[PDB]
Amino acid sequence: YEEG
Amino acid sequence: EPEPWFFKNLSRKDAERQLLAPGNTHGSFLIRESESTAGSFSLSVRDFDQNQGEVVKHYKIRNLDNGGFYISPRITFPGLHELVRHYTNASDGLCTRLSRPCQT
């Protein structure tokens, strides 16, 4: 997952 | 009557598969049930990178006890409609702004  | 962007039972891999398929482009997205965190949802979005070319990034949508959602702790929403509207308006941390729901 990417972090926002 | 799921929203055009809501794909309840679509896996991460099938979301990637469809988002990267013809009819979709940069900003194309969908929200599905998380395969990592039971009871939560995941946001999948297509993006174009300098070297990677077409790519899909996933963000965990975290649940707030007693109602609420956030991708980043610093800004929360009372519902997914608000979250989608927010990220449609501004990328605000994400790799790109949410454009159109996945076309199938």
Short mmCIF file of N, CA, C and O in Angstrom, two decimals:
data_model
loop_
_atom_site.label_atom_id
_atom_site.label_comp_id
_atom_site.label_asym_id
_atom_site.label_seq_id
_atom_site.Cartn_x
_atom_site.Cartn_y
_atom_site.Cartn_z
N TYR A 1 0.80 -1.20 0.00
CA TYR A 1 0.00 0.00 0.00
C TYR A 1 0.84 1.26 0.00
O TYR A 1 1.96 1.29 0.53
N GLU A 2 0.31 2.29 -0.65
CA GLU A 2 0.93 3.59 -0.72
C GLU A 2 0.34 4.38 0.44
O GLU A 2 -0.74 4.06 0.92
N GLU A 3 1.08 5.38 0.90
CA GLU A 3 0.63 6.23 1.99
C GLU A 3 0.23 7.57 1.39
O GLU A 3 0.91 8.06 0.48
N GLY A 4 -0.84 8.15 1.90
CA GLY A 4 -1.31 9.45 1.43
C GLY A 4 -0.99 10.50 2.47
O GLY A 4 0.08 10.40 3.11
N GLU B 1 -27.65 -1.08 -5.22
CA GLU B 1 -27.34 0.06 -6.12
C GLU B 1 -25.97 0.65 -5.72
O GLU B 1 -25.89 1.74 -5.16
N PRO B 2 -24.91 -0.11 -5.93
CA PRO B 2 -23.59 0.40 -5.58
C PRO B 2 -23.22 1.58 -6.45
O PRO B 2 -23.65 1.68 -7.59
N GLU B 3 -22.41 2.48 -5.89
CA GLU B 3 -21.95 3.66 -6.61
C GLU B 3 -21.11 3.12 -7.75
O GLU B 3 -20.58 2.02 -7.67
N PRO B 4 -20.96 3.91 -8.83
CA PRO B 4 -20.17 3.42 -9.96
C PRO B 4 -18.73 3.02 -9.61
O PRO B 4 -18.15 2.14 -10.27
N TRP B 5 -18.20 3.61 -8.54
CA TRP B 5 -16.83 3.33 -8.09
C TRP B 5 -16.70 2.19 -7.08
O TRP B 5 -15.58 1.77 -6.78
N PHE B 6 -17.83 1.69 -6.57
CA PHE B 6 -17.82 0.62 -5.56
C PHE B 6 -17.91 -0.82 -6.11
O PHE B 6 -18.93 -1.24 -6.68
N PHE B 7 -16.83 -1.58 -5.91
CA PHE B 7 -16.71 -2.96 -6.35
C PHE B 7 -16.43 -3.79 -5.10
O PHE B 7 -15.30 -4.22 -4.85
N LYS B 8 -17.50 -4.06 -4.36
CA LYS B 8 -17.47 -4.79 -3.11
C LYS B 8 -16.54 -5.98 -3.01
O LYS B 8 -15.68 -6.02 -2.15
N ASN B 9 -16.74 -6.96 -3.89
CA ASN B 9 -15.96 -8.19 -3.87
C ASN B 9 -14.82 -8.34 -4.86
O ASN B 9 -14.34 -9.46 -5.06
N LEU B 10 -14.38 -7.25 -5.49
CA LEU B 10 -13.30 -7.37 -6.45
C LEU B 10 -11.96 -7.44 -5.72
O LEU B 10 -11.71 -6.67 -4.80
N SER B 11 -11.14 -8.41 -6.08
CA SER B 11 -9.82 -8.58 -5.48
C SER B 11 -8.86 -7.46 -5.92
O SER B 11 -9.08 -6.80 -6.94
N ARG B 12 -7.76 -7.29 -5.18
CA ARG B 12 -6.74 -6.30 -5.53
C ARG B 12 -6.23 -6.57 -6.95
O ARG B 12 -6.10 -5.64 -7.75
N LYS B 13 -5.95 -7.84 -7.28
CA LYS B 13 -5.43 -8.18 -8.59
C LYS B 13 -6.43 -7.95 -9.71
O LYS B 13 -6.05 -7.59 -10.80
N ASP B 14 -7.71 -8.22 -9.47
CA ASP B 14 -8.69 -7.99 -10.52
C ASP B 14 -8.93 -6.48 -10.67
O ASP B 14 -9.26 -6.02 -11.77
N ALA B 15 -8.77 -5.72 -9.59
CA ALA B 15 -8.93 -4.27 -9.66
C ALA B 15 -7.80 -3.74 -10.54
O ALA B 15 -8.02 -2.90 -11.41
N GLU B 16 -6.59 -4.24 -10.32
CA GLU B 16 -5.44 -3.83 -11.13
C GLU B 16 -5.70 -4.15 -12.59
O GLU B 16 -5.58 -3.30 -13.47
N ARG B 17 -6.12 -5.39 -12.82
CA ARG B 17 -6.41 -5.89 -14.14
C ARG B 17 -7.41 -5.02 -14.90
O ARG B 17 -7.20 -4.67 -16.07
N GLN B 18 -8.49 -4.65 -14.24
CA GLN B 18 -9.51 -3.84 -14.91
C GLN B 18 -9.11 -2.39 -15.06
O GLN B 18 -9.32 -1.79 -16.12
N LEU B 19 -8.47 -1.84 -14.03
CA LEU B 19 -8.02 -0.45 -14.08
C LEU B 19 -6.99 -0.25 -15.17
O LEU B 19 -6.95 0.80 -15.79
N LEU B 20 -6.18 -1.27 -15.45
CA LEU B 20 -5.14 -1.13 -16.47
C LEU B 20 -5.62 -1.52 -17.86
O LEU B 20 -4.86 -1.43 -18.84
N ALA B 21 -6.88 -1.95 -17.94
CA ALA B 21 -7.47 -2.36 -19.21
C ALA B 21 -8.03 -1.17 -20.00
O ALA B 21 -8.29 -0.11 -19.43
N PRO B 22 -8.21 -1.33 -21.33
CA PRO B 22 -8.75 -0.27 -22.19
C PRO B 22 -10.06 0.27 -21.63
O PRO B 22 -10.81 -0.48 -21.01
N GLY B 23 -10.32 1.55 -21.85
CA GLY B 23 -11.53 2.18 -21.34
C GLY B 23 -11.23 2.97 -20.08
O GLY B 23 -12.03 3.80 -19.64
N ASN B 24 -10.06 2.72 -19.50
CA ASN B 24 -9.63 3.41 -18.29
C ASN B 24 -8.37 4.22 -18.56
O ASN B 24 -7.69 4.03 -19.56
N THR B 25 -8.09 5.15 -17.66
CA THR B 25 -6.92 6.00 -17.81
C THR B 25 -6.43 6.51 -16.47
O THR B 25 -6.87 6.08 -15.41
N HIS B 26 -5.49 7.44 -16.51
CA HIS B 26 -4.92 8.04 -15.31
C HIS B 26 -6.06 8.62 -14.46
O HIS B 26 -6.97 9.28 -14.99
N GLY B 27 -6.07 8.33 -13.17
CA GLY B 27 -7.11 8.84 -12.30
C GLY B 27 -8.27 7.87 -12.11
O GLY B 27 -9.09 8.08 -11.22
N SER B 28 -8.36 6.85 -12.97
CA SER B 28 -9.42 5.84 -12.87
C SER B 28 -9.28 5.13 -11.53
O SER B 28 -8.18 4.72 -11.15
N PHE B 29 -10.40 4.94 -10.83
CA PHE B 29 -10.33 4.32 -9.52
C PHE B 29 -11.55 3.49 -9.16
O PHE B 29 -12.57 3.49 -9.88
N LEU B 30 -11.44 2.83 -8.01
CA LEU B 30 -12.51 2.03 -7.45
C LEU B 30 -12.19 1.81 -5.99
O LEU B 30 -11.05 1.97 -5.56
N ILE B 31 -13.23 1.50 -5.22
CA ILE B 31 -13.10 1.20 -3.81
C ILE B 31 -13.68 -0.21 -3.68
O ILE B 31 -14.71 -0.52 -4.29
N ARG B 32 -12.98 -1.07 -2.96
CA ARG B 32 -13.37 -2.47 -2.76
C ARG B 32 -13.13 -2.87 -1.31
O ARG B 32 -12.47 -2.15 -0.56
N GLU B 33 -13.61 -4.04 -0.92
CA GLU B 33 -13.36 -4.50 0.43
C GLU B 33 -11.87 -4.86 0.48
O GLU B 33 -11.29 -5.35 -0.49
N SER B 34 -11.23 -4.50 1.59
CA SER B 34 -9.81 -4.78 1.77
C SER B 34 -9.57 -6.28 1.91
O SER B 34 -10.34 -6.98 2.57
N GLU B 35 -8.52 -6.77 1.25
CA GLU B 35 -8.13 -8.17 1.37
C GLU B 35 -7.12 -8.30 2.52
O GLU B 35 -6.71 -9.40 2.90
N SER B 36 -6.74 -7.16 3.10
CA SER B 36 -5.76 -7.14 4.19
C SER B 36 -6.33 -6.89 5.57
O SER B 36 -5.82 -7.43 6.55
N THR B 37 -7.37 -6.06 5.64
CA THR B 37 -8.00 -5.68 6.90
C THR B 37 -9.52 -5.87 6.86
O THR B 37 -10.25 -5.06 6.28
N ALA B 38 -9.96 -6.98 7.45
CA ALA B 38 -11.37 -7.36 7.52
C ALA B 38 -12.24 -6.24 8.08
O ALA B 38 -11.95 -5.70 9.15
N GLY B 39 -13.30 -5.90 7.35
CA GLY B 39 -14.21 -4.85 7.80
C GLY B 39 -13.89 -3.47 7.24
O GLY B 39 -14.67 -2.53 7.43
N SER B 40 -12.73 -3.34 6.60
CA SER B 40 -12.30 -2.08 6.00
C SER B 40 -12.29 -2.15 4.47
O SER B 40 -12.50 -3.22 3.88
N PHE B 41 -12.01 -1.02 3.83
CA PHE B 41 -12.00 -0.93 2.38
C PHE B 41 -10.65 -0.46 1.86
O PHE B 41 -9.83 0.07 2.63
N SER B 42 -10.40 -0.69 0.57
CA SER B 42 -9.18 -0.28 -0.09
C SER B 42 -9.54 0.54 -1.32
O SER B 42 -10.55 0.27 -1.99
N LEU B 43 -8.71 1.54 -1.61
CA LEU B 43 -8.88 2.41 -2.76
C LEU B 43 -7.81 2.02 -3.78
O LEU B 43 -6.63 1.94 -3.42
N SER B 44 -8.21 1.75 -5.02
CA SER B 44 -7.25 1.40 -6.06
C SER B 44 -7.34 2.49 -7.13
O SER B 44 -8.45 2.84 -7.54
N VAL B 45 -6.20 3.04 -7.57
CA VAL B 45 -6.22 4.11 -8.56
C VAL B 45 -5.10 4.00 -9.59
O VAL B 45 -3.98 3.61 -9.26
N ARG B 46 -5.44 4.26 -10.84
CA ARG B 46 -4.50 4.19 -11.95
C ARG B 46 -3.73 5.52 -12.04
O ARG B 46 -4.30 6.60 -11.85
N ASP B 47 -2.43 5.43 -12.32
CA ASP B 47 -1.59 6.61 -12.41
C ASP B 47 -0.54 6.38 -13.50
O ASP B 47 -0.26 5.23 -13.84
N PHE B 48 -0.05 7.45 -14.11
CA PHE B 48 0.99 7.35 -15.15
C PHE B 48 2.28 7.89 -14.55
O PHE B 48 2.31 9.02 -14.10
N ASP B 49 3.33 7.08 -14.56
CA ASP B 49 4.63 7.48 -14.00
C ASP B 49 5.70 7.68 -15.07
O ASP B 49 5.70 7.01 -16.11
N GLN B 50 6.64 8.58 -14.77
CA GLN B 50 7.76 8.88 -15.66
C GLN B 50 8.44 7.65 -16.28
O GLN B 50 8.73 7.61 -17.47
N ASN B 51 8.67 6.61 -15.48
CA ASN B 51 9.32 5.42 -15.98
C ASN B 51 8.42 4.19 -16.01
O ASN B 51 8.46 3.41 -16.97
N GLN B 52 7.61 4.01 -14.97
CA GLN B 52 6.73 2.85 -14.90
C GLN B 52 5.68 2.82 -16.01
O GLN B 52 5.25 1.74 -16.44
N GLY B 53 5.31 3.99 -16.52
CA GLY B 53 4.28 4.02 -17.53
C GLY B 53 3.00 3.84 -16.74
O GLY B 53 2.91 4.39 -15.64
N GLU B 54 2.06 3.05 -17.23
CA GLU B 54 0.78 2.82 -16.54
C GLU B 54 0.95 1.96 -15.29
O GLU B 54 1.51 0.87 -15.36
N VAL B 55 0.40 2.43 -14.17
CA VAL B 55 0.53 1.73 -12.91
C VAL B 55 -0.71 1.89 -12.02
O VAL B 55 -1.53 2.77 -12.26
N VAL B 56 -0.91 0.99 -11.06
CA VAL B 56 -2.04 1.12 -10.14
C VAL B 56 -1.48 1.14 -8.73
O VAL B 56 -0.58 0.36 -8.40
N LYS B 57 -1.95 2.09 -7.93
CA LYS B 57 -1.54 2.22 -6.53
C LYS B 57 -2.75 1.96 -5.64
O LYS B 57 -3.89 2.26 -6.02
N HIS B 58 -2.50 1.37 -4.47
CA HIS B 58 -3.56 1.03 -3.53
C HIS B 58 -3.34 1.80 -2.23
O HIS B 58 -2.21 1.94 -1.77
N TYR B 59 -4.43 2.26 -1.63
CA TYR B 59 -4.40 2.99 -0.36
C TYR B 59 -5.36 2.31 0.59
O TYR B 59 -6.46 1.91 0.18
N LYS B 60 -4.95 2.15 1.84
CA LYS B 60 -5.84 1.55 2.83
C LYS B 60 -6.78 2.64 3.31
O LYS B 60 -6.35 3.77 3.56
N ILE B 61 -8.07 2.34 3.38
CA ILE B 61 -9.03 3.30 3.91
C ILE B 61 -9.26 2.78 5.32
O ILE B 61 -9.70 1.65 5.51
N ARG B 62 -8.87 3.57 6.32
CA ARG B 62 -9.04 3.15 7.70
C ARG B 62 -10.39 3.59 8.27
O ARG B 62 -10.88 4.67 7.94
N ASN B 63 -10.96 2.78 9.14
CA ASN B 63 -12.25 3.06 9.78
C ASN B 63 -12.05 3.75 11.14
O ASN B 63 -11.12 3.42 11.88
N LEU B 64 -12.90 4.74 11.43
CA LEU B 64 -12.87 5.43 12.71
C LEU B 64 -13.92 4.73 13.55
O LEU B 64 -15.00 4.38 13.02
N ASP B 65 -13.61 4.47 14.82
CA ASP B 65 -14.56 3.84 15.73
C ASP B 65 -15.85 4.69 15.74
O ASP B 65 -15.81 5.92 15.88
N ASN B 66 -16.98 4.02 15.51
CA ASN B 66 -18.31 4.62 15.49
C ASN B 66 -18.64 5.49 14.28
O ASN B 66 -19.57 6.31 14.32
N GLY B 67 -17.94 5.25 13.18
CA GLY B 67 -18.21 5.98 11.96
C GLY B 67 -17.14 6.94 11.49
O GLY B 67 -16.69 7.80 12.24
N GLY B 68 -16.73 6.78 10.24
CA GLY B 68 -15.73 7.67 9.69
C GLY B 68 -14.67 6.94 8.91
O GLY B 68 -14.41 5.75 9.16
N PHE B 69 -13.99 7.67 8.03
CA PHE B 69 -12.97 7.10 7.16
C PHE B 69 -11.82 8.07 6.91
O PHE B 69 -12.02 9.29 6.86
N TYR B 70 -10.62 7.51 6.72
CA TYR B 70 -9.43 8.30 6.42
C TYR B 70 -8.35 7.44 5.80
O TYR B 70 -8.29 6.23 6.02
N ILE B 71 -7.56 8.06 4.93
CA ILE B 71 -6.43 7.41 4.29
C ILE B 71 -5.21 7.92 5.06
O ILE B 71 -4.26 7.18 5.35
N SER B 72 -5.28 9.19 5.43
CA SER B 72 -4.23 9.87 6.18
C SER B 72 -4.90 10.38 7.48
O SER B 72 -5.91 11.10 7.41
N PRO B 73 -4.34 10.04 8.66
CA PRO B 73 -4.86 10.44 9.98
C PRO B 73 -5.21 11.90 10.12
O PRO B 73 -6.12 12.25 10.86
N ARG B 74 -4.48 12.75 9.41
CA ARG B 74 -4.65 14.20 9.46
C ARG B 74 -5.95 14.74 8.88
O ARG B 74 -6.27 15.92 9.08
N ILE B 75 -6.69 13.92 8.14
CA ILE B 75 -7.94 14.41 7.59
C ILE B 75 -8.93 13.25 7.46
O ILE B 75 -8.66 12.27 6.75
N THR B 76 -10.07 13.38 8.13
CA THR B 76 -11.07 12.32 8.14
C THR B 76 -12.37 12.76 7.51
O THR B 76 -12.61 13.95 7.31
N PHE B 77 -13.23 11.78 7.22
CA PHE B 77 -14.51 12.04 6.59
C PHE B 77 -15.60 11.22 7.26
O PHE B 77 -15.32 10.17 7.84
N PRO B 78 -16.84 11.74 7.29
CA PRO B 78 -17.95 11.01 7.92
C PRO B 78 -18.43 9.84 7.04
O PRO B 78 -19.11 8.93 7.52
N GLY B 79 -18.05 9.85 5.77
CA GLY B 79 -18.45 8.79 4.86
C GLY B 79 -17.59 8.73 3.61
O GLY B 79 -16.81 9.63 3.33
N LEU B 80 -17.76 7.65 2.85
CA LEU B 80 -17.01 7.45 1.61
C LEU B 80 -17.37 8.46 0.53
O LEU B 80 -16.53 8.78 -0.33
N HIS B 81 -18.61 8.95 0.54
CA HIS B 81 -18.99 9.94 -0.46
C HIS B 81 -18.14 11.19 -0.26
O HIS B 81 -17.59 11.74 -1.22
N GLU B 82 -17.98 11.61 0.99
CA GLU B 82 -17.18 12.79 1.31
C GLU B 82 -15.73 12.56 0.93
O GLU B 82 -15.08 13.44 0.37
N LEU B 83 -15.20 11.37 1.24
CA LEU B 83 -13.82 11.03 0.92
C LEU B 83 -13.57 11.07 -0.59
O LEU B 83 -12.57 11.64 -1.03
N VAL B 84 -14.47 10.49 -1.37
CA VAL B 84 -14.32 10.49 -2.82
C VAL B 84 -14.41 11.90 -3.39
O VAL B 84 -13.64 12.26 -4.29
N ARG B 85 -15.31 12.71 -2.84
CA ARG B 85 -15.49 14.08 -3.28
C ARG B 85 -14.20 14.89 -2.97
O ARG B 85 -13.67 15.62 -3.82
N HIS B 86 -13.64 14.65 -1.78
CA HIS B 86 -12.43 15.33 -1.36
C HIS B 86 -11.25 15.06 -2.25
O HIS B 86 -10.55 16.00 -2.65
N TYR B 87 -11.01 13.78 -2.53
CA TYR B 87 -9.88 13.38 -3.36
C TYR B 87 -10.14 13.59 -4.84
O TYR B 87 -9.23 13.49 -5.66
N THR B 88 -11.41 13.82 -5.19
CA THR B 88 -11.75 14.14 -6.58
C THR B 88 -11.34 15.62 -6.76
O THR B 88 -10.81 16.01 -7.79
N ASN B 89 -11.56 16.42 -5.72
CA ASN B 89 -11.22 17.84 -5.73
C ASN B 89 -9.73 18.13 -5.60
O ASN B 89 -9.21 19.03 -6.27
N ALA B 90 -9.04 17.38 -4.75
CA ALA B 90 -7.60 17.57 -4.53
C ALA B 90 -6.90 16.24 -4.36
O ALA B 90 -7.48 15.32 -3.78
N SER B 91 -5.68 16.12 -4.86
CA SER B 91 -4.93 14.88 -4.69
C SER B 91 -4.58 14.74 -3.19
O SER B 91 -4.55 13.62 -2.65
N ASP B 92 -4.27 15.87 -2.55
CA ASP B 92 -3.97 15.97 -1.12
C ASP B 92 -3.26 14.77 -0.49
O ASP B 92 -3.72 14.20 0.51
N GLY B 93 -2.12 14.39 -1.08
CA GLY B 93 -1.35 13.25 -0.58
C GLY B 93 -1.31 12.10 -1.57
O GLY B 93 -0.29 11.44 -1.74
N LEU B 94 -2.44 11.84 -2.23
CA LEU B 94 -2.48 10.75 -3.19
C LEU B 94 -1.59 10.99 -4.41
O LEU B 94 -1.18 12.12 -4.69
N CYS B 95 -1.33 9.92 -5.15
CA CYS B 95 -0.51 9.97 -6.35
C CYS B 95 -1.16 10.78 -7.47
O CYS B 95 -0.48 11.23 -8.39
N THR B 96 -2.48 10.95 -7.41
CA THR B 96 -3.21 11.73 -8.41
C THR B 96 -4.64 11.96 -7.90
O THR B 96 -5.04 11.36 -6.89
N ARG B 97 -5.37 12.89 -8.53
CA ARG B 97 -6.75 13.14 -8.12
C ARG B 97 -7.62 12.01 -8.65
O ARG B 97 -7.30 11.41 -9.68
N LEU B 98 -8.69 11.69 -7.93
CA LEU B 98 -9.60 10.66 -8.39
C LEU B 98 -10.36 11.27 -9.58
O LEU B 98 -10.95 12.36 -9.46
N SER B 99 -10.32 10.60 -10.72
CA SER B 99 -11.02 11.09 -11.90
C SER B 99 -12.34 10.34 -12.10
O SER B 99 -13.34 10.72 -11.52
N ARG B 100 -12.33 9.25 -12.86
CA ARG B 100 -13.57 8.50 -13.10
C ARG B 100 -13.49 7.08 -12.57
O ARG B 100 -12.42 6.44 -12.59
N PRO B 101 -14.63 6.54 -12.11
CA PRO B 101 -14.70 5.18 -11.59
C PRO B 101 -14.31 4.24 -12.73
O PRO B 101 -14.43 4.58 -13.92
N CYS B 102 -13.82 3.07 -12.37
CA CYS B 102 -13.40 2.07 -13.32
C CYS B 102 -14.54 1.77 -14.31
O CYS B 102 -15.68 1.56 -13.89
N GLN B 103 -14.23 1.76 -15.60
CA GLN B 103 -15.20 1.45 -16.66
C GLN B 103 -15.10 -0.06 -16.94
O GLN B 103 -13.99 -0.59 -17.09
N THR B 104 -16.23 -0.75 -17.04
CA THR B 104 -16.21 -2.20 -17.22
C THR B 104 -16.96 -2.71 -18.47
O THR B 104 -16.95 -3.93 -18.73
#
